[PDB]
Amino acid sequence: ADEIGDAAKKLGDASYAFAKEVDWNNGIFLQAPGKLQPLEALKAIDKMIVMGAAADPKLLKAAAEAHHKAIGSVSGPNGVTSRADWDSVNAALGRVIASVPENMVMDVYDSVSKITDPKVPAYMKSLVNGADAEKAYEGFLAFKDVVKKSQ
Template identity: 45%
Template sequence: MAKLLPRVVAMVAVLALCNLWLPAFVPPPAGQSLRHGVHLSTAVGAAAVLGAAPAAFADKIDDAATKLSEASYPFLKEIDWTSPVYGSLPNANPVKVLAVINKALVMGASMDSAALKKGVLAHASAIGHVDSKGMIPLPDYAAINAAIGHMVASVPKNQVIDVFNAAGDVVRKEEVGAYMKSLVNSGDAEAAYKAFWEFKDVVAAAQR
């Protein structure tokens, strides 16, 4: 159980980021379908196993994470992180929620241990720097994005898709999206999503 705990913590972080970065704010780029375009970006993209992938890919993923973080940070600062909405799933079916957790645990169990450890440490560091508004510093945000990219990338693509599909049955993104986007500057949200899509492409190029 003790060995599984870090994986559970990491997967909770992944799912939290999924809820933030799924197309809840803006639709997928023109010409790309929601289910077939976004699933790879569900957990902040996909890349090869950390340590098994060529160093060039790792550098590209980290660089892309930095670019994503800088482009999306203005949007991030506009979100009210003290709102209870981010810790709740209104009207969610408990059975479907358990299905998401199950798929997430399966994915977490497949993660590369080095990438997983780095992800957990990145989150732990960020938690120590959270301000009164629930925000974290940009360097911590960039480290988390890079770490999660490597974590999710270290599992087979089908497991990433399984988590996305299960989560899609819990949250009605079409309904939630309009409301969530109304709470922030739409231009910043769109810029953040565009940067996220580019990040997804970089890490997907190295996915196993």
């Protein structure tokens, strides 16, 4: 047990209602988040690849395992994993994030932002309950504070 795991349970309390509202089977998630821009997108993928190579390989393995288990508990009309598996994925990802330097994480974020059209967040939010999305994000903010402490 660790503090990221405890923070993941609070994150689940804040964010699972939102996860149940997302239609995970919508094909839109395969499309670029705006205009397809291969050269800029490759720069973002490169920052991810750098981060993945730097991450604790054991924590990467555990995060992959948590997603395998999560796939197994998918149910209902939107393809949402169970509450327990949601929390397990989020904890495992938090551990991976904490295992690399903050710069690496910020470089992925900035590089993905560069290819994301300004309308995409509002469009995604419009498909779910906006107050639940807001609660989920406020949950994320608290969670990342715990992740940073462990980083």
